[PDB]
Write a protein that binds this ligand. Sequence first.
Ligand SMILES: C[S@@+](CC[C@H](N)C(=O)[O-])C[C@H]1O[C@@H](n2cnc3c(N)ncnc32)[C@H](O)[C@@H]1O
Length: 327
Amino acid sequence: TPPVTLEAARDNDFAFDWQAYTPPVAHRLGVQEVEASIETLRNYIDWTPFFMTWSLAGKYPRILEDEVVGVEAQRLFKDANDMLDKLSAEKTLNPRGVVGLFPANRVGDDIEIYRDETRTHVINVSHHLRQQTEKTGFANYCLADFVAPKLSGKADYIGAFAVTGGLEEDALADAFEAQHDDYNKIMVKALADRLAEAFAEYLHERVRKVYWGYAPNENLSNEELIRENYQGIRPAPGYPACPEHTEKATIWELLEVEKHTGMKLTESFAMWPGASVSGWYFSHPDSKYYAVAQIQRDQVEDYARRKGMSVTEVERWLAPNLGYDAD
Ligand SMILES: C[S@@+](CC[C@H](N)C(=O)[O-])C[C@H]1O[C@@H](n2cnc3c(N)ncnc32)[C@H](O)[C@@H]1O
């Protein structure tokens, strides 16, 4: 579809009646270090991606019943589960995380995060991109649209989190590798992954129910959680609704991630350990995932100005999304 100017994009933003909506107030504002045991996390594991890691197709649990790959799947799963028992027992892989909730308001395509409820001092800004193609009856989405504009005078909030399956991940895989045991070496990385992702599901649930607290009586099964049948979203930088990776640096700063979990970001803004998940929390009932997709040169120059970066640095990071021939 033909791109649109940034201005026409911004003119077709998410239309909602803010004067008639009262965003839910965050019950626990602030930053809180969190933890979760392997035992608790196992109830939140989505196993389908583990089987796909072992090049097996099929969705858990039906996959355990496949007359051809069923038996290999059952072996994998049994070994998966005995290793979990062992890391659980020996406390050798320890999931760590941090979560935070903040007063926030939308100004343009960005989200201002305030030091407190007087909302007079911006401690950080969460920058976002807006879809830049001609949209038919649908707004040109930007994640900032799901937070109340500062102009509406409504108090709103945003949350963030960073979780890891454990800082031991490499020590464990490194040891399986030294003795040429690539099976378990894969096994331990595949599990740390499931655990990181389980912790993100579990923590999002605690946020919906207690920390932000807008859905205190929520009672979803793990399959309902996997189907995302809850109110709200937890977009992660790097994913399609927010493809710009350097924003992981804002989360690291807001939650003081390294100080509270030992998790670090690299030169290309990847997270260490490898089994880690970071992102934002949005409470709006209408929030959803989508792809920003191809963005034009006017959006790149504006984004660079807001971020305080040169247009070429922004070109490096948004390269998969430039809707024009970059250089
Ligand atoms: C990666 S899966 C994780 C849950 C799944 N059951 C699993 O275990 O893999 C879905 C997650 O990816 C991120 N995500 C997916 N689509 C996204 C989008 N379009 N924009 C931003 N983040 C997105 C969100 O953090 C979301 O919770």
